[PDB]
Design a protein around this nucleic acid. Structure first.
Lengths: 48, 93, 117, 98, 88, 78, 92
DNA sequence: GGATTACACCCAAGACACCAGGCACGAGACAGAAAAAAACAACGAAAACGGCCACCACCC
RNA sequence: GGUGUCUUGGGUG
DNA sequence: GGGTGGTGGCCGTTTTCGTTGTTTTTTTCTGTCTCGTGCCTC
């Protein structure tokens, strides 16, 4: 259980858009801004 | 004890017999209560039927024959005591 | 009254013990204001607009707790509901034009909105 | 008592129609700041309507002025851009059943 | 012996009925027999599971193993009932 | 699944038991008997399994059931 | 964690009685089953013997009587010989 | 269903704790004994219950 | 000498 | 006709109370389990 918690924290630290599972959430209900989310999109690093 | 458990059978004695019966190193508080209750129940069932048999034969006292009749004419009691010989019990006609 | 009753239960070994409450009437009062002193008074939309208050009415729900044991609770305040201005529960519904002017309200203002903060 | 009060206040103050922890998957914009720039803008804002189709989808059919709209929604008043045809405005003699 | 307890039970279920000496002897044999069956099975149950204590749970399981059908259900009921009452 | 105990299988068992000729009604009869047998052993086995708070019937549970039924089995204590 | 069987002792005995003979794992399992079974029979009977006679100690005498009750005839006599000889030698 | 439905730009108004059950301290519940008044077995008696006898009715 | 972050709604081109 | 299914009186014998010898269950204080409570998170 605890090693899988570690696996999930490490995964959602890098990619919080994994199909077929809940998202790592913040205190306010919003999801965590993962690094992938930092890098992708109109507003991400590359295009923004 | 037995008064508190609502039983006639001796809880203290059953407990002691469990302790000295080489069954386990320790014996729980509820075990002799449970066991005494079971023994009393079975005794009650057999005495019920055997008493009924005595009434049929018009004898107030209960004799081994009545016990045999009671046990063998009851399916589950009969299985429970399938390998038991009741002295002076005879057999079912 | 959609779901008008709650029920707890425990049978065990033996008495059946149900604790139960039945929701009753709703009571709707005019919008009031409560100060940090504890004093209260009527609240009007202009005051609510100036002091960044919410213009809402207190809602009370009667609750009647019952218990049954077979061997085999006042006007609870549940929250404040915001009031639509110029509706039947607004404090501007009465007060014809003169007192509307005295209450700093524009006669052309038609209502239809809420005041939150 | 703070549960109902905080919920009603949160929904009417943010527009997110639903529980606070379910802000996503809840309708947004249900409540809006009343437009008081001029008088007619207030009168129009108090009579506005919204179809929650969303901009995810280029189906032009629900954005279209329809024959059955006659007398019920204004044939001319609609926002430009992504709300065109989705935000409607009641005709002067329109009325909503109770 | 269990004579006095057997008698008490007898007076519960048949107030005006007695019992011969031989029949009492048979009842005593019975009680000791069932005692040994149940205690023995409970002992083995405790050993198999590396438990050093025989509790009411071993007694119950042993009863379920040893007794047939309705007798098992009723005996289990009486045991649990007695333990509950004693505990109260 | 009791029908999975086929006529040929029962015939083989009877052969090992030295039976030369078999009435047609035997097979169903046998299915009944076996069924009862299994019910009695498995019951006790599951009881042991339930006593140990397990969800897995072990070989030892079966061995104990067989033993208490006077059907001592050698070879599965390992 | 550690696991235990009579296997090596059964093997040693096997090499005593048949120097050029081996044994399958299953047959070894059956032998282990056997040894445990007879152990429980003898120890159980000896326990009852000690209890019947109001004794708190199981001795070689209880074991011997149990052997005489449980085993038939010549098997019993021979077993008794082996046991008695082993105890007499051990004490010395 | 990982995406995503043009680019730049302007202000309205909102969260800034979601939550229980994580770790350690202090208050109930349970196990350990024994002398003394209470329960079990023992000494003796009682009419009451069971087998026998004087006397009795029926069938293949 | 150092004037913070994200969404909802309404517009301009 | 030889048993077996009934009636009523007399004799054996007997297991439960009156009462006690012998054995016995546990309350309070102390040392372990178990839960309530406080700080912090294409």
């Amino acid at each position: 259980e605890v090693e899988q918690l570690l696996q999930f924290h490490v995964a959602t630290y890098m990619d919080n858009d994994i199909a077929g599972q809940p998202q790592a959430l913040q205190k306010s209900g919003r999801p965590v801004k993962a690094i992938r989310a930092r890098l992708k999109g109109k507003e991400g690093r590359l295009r923004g | 004890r037995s008064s508190r458990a609502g039983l006639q059978f001796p809880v203290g004695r059953v407990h002691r017999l469990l302790r000295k019966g080489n069954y386990s190193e320790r014996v729980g508080a509820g075990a002799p209560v449970y066991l005494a209750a079971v023994l009393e129940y079975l005794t009650a069932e057999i005495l019920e039927l055997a008493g009924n048999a005595a009434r049929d034969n018009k004898k107030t006292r209960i004799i081994p024959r009545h016990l045999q009749l009671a046990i063998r004419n009851d399916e589950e009691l009969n299985k429970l005591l399938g390998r038991v010989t009741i002295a002076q019990g005879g057999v079912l006609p | 009254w959609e779901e008008p009753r709650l029920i707890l239960d425990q049978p065990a070994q033996n008495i059946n013990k149900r604790y139960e409450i039945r929701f009753g009437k709703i009571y709707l009062s005019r919008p009031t204001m409560t100060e940090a002193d504890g004093t209260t008074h009527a609240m009007f939309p202009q005051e609510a607009r100036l002091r960044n208050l919410t213009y809402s009415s207190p809602v009370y729900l009667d609750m009647e707790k019952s218990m049954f044991t077979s061997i085999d609770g006042n006007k609870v305040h549940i929250g404040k509901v915001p009031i639509m201005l110029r509706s039947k529960f607004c404090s501007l519904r009465t007060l014809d034009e003169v007192d509307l002017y005295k209450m700093k309200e524009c006669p052309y203002d038609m209502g239809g909105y809420f005041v939150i903060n | 008592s703070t549960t109902i009060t905080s919920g009603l206040k949160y929904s009417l103050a943010t527009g997110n129609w639903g529980e606070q922890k379910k802000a996503m998957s809840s309708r947004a914009g249900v409540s809006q700041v009343l437009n008081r720039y001029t008088y007619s803008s207030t009168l129009s804002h108090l009579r506005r309507t919204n179809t929650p189709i969303g901009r995810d989808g280029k189906l032009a059919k629900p954005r279209q002025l329809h024959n059955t709209h006659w007398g019920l929604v204004c044939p001319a008043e609609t926002p430009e851009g992504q709300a065109c045809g989705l935000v409607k405005n009641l005709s002067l003699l329109s009325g909503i059943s109770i | 012996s269990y004579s006095i307890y057997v008698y008490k039970v007898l007076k519960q279920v048949h107030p005006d009925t007695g019992i011969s000496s031989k029949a009492m002897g048979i009842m005593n044999s019975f009680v000791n027999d069932i005692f040994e069956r149940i205690a023995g099975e409970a002992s083995r149950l405790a050993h198999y599971n590396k438990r050093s204590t025989i509790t009411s749970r071993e007694i119950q399981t042993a009863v379920r193993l040893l007794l047939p059908g309705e007798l098992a259900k009723h005996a289990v009921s009486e045991g649990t009932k007695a333990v509950t009452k004693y505990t109260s | 699944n009791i029908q999975g105990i086929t006529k040929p299988a029962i015939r083989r068992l009877a052969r090992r038991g030295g039976v030369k000729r078999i009435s047609g009604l035997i097979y169903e009869e046998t299915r009944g008997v076996l069924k009862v047998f299994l019910e009695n052993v498995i019951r006790d086995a599951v009881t042991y399994t339930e006593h140990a708070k397990r969800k897995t019937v072990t070989a030892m549970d079966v061995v104990y059931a067989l033993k208490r039924q006077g059907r001592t089995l050698y070879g599965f204590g390992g």
